């Protein structure tokens, strides 16, 4: 059952597709096929290769009008190191003055970043519960809890210069708050002076852990 269109998806459109590296790449939608319970989308990548993909593994090659995205929306966004890569995630906050009109993204591996309105792309056919295709179960479970509770977001008030313990990979590290940016805090780990931007409601921050573990 070949199709030339699926709603707004049309054969020949520009698209992003997910590769097995989990990075996303520009290409062209070359076929739509009904296969079992749904549709498959064949993508020819600009650089190298052809993939047959599910609808949650393609994204539009345009930056959406900001108001079409919501907390919980499934997106691909720019993830910088240094490169620039496109990686999937979930919108955690929409643009407001307090965040300098940026989107907060929680990526599928648990990385967090603010991105601009021109640095994200909507996934075409996400799952209704958008987090159900997140492979990392700890990130999946976190996003379900976060989106379900939203707009209830307990956070710690931190100030530049404040010393706290911050968790990383099973150890609690002496650290310092360097900067606050909206719902993120830039933490300097004192043992090596590398930083990490962490959500101010994350229980990786000792004050937030302390509050959530009290009862």
């Amino acid at each position: 059952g070949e199709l030339s269109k699926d709603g707004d998806l049309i054969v020949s459109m520009r698209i992003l597709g997910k590769k097995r590296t989990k990075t996303w790449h520009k290409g062209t939608l070359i076929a739509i096929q009904t296969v079992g319970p749904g549709k498959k989308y064949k993508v020819k990548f600009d650089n190298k290769g052809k993939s047959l993909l599910s609808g949650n593994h393609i994204a539009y090659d345009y930056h959406p009008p900001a108001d079409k995205l919501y907390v919980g929306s499934r997106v691909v966004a720019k993830y910088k190191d240094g490169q620039v890569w496109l990686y999937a995630g979930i919108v955690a906050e929409t643009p407001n003055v307090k965040n300098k009109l940026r989107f907060l993204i929680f990526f599928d591996d648990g990385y967090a970043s603010y991105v601009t309105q021109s640095e994200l792309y909507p996934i075409c056919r996400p799952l209704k519960k958008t987090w159900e295709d997140i492979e990392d179960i700890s990130c999946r479970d976190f996003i379900e809890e976060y989106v379900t509770a939203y707009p209830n977001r307990p956070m710690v008030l931190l100030k530049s210069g404040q010393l706290i313990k911050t968790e990383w990979e099973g150890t609690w590290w002496k650290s310092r708050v360097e900067e606050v940016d909206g719902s993120l805090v830039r933490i300097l780990f004192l043992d090596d002076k590398r930083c990490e931007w962490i959500y101010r409601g994350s229980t990786r921050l000792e004050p937030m852990f302390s509050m959530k573990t009290s009862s």
């Binding site: 591996d109 976190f142 099973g170 590398r194 930083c195």
Partner: peptide, 12 residues
């Protein structure tokens, strides 16, 4: 200069 992500919650 950043570490690899520690994710959103403490490791289990």
């Amino acid at each position: 200069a950043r570490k690899s992500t520690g994710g959103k919650a403490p490791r289990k």
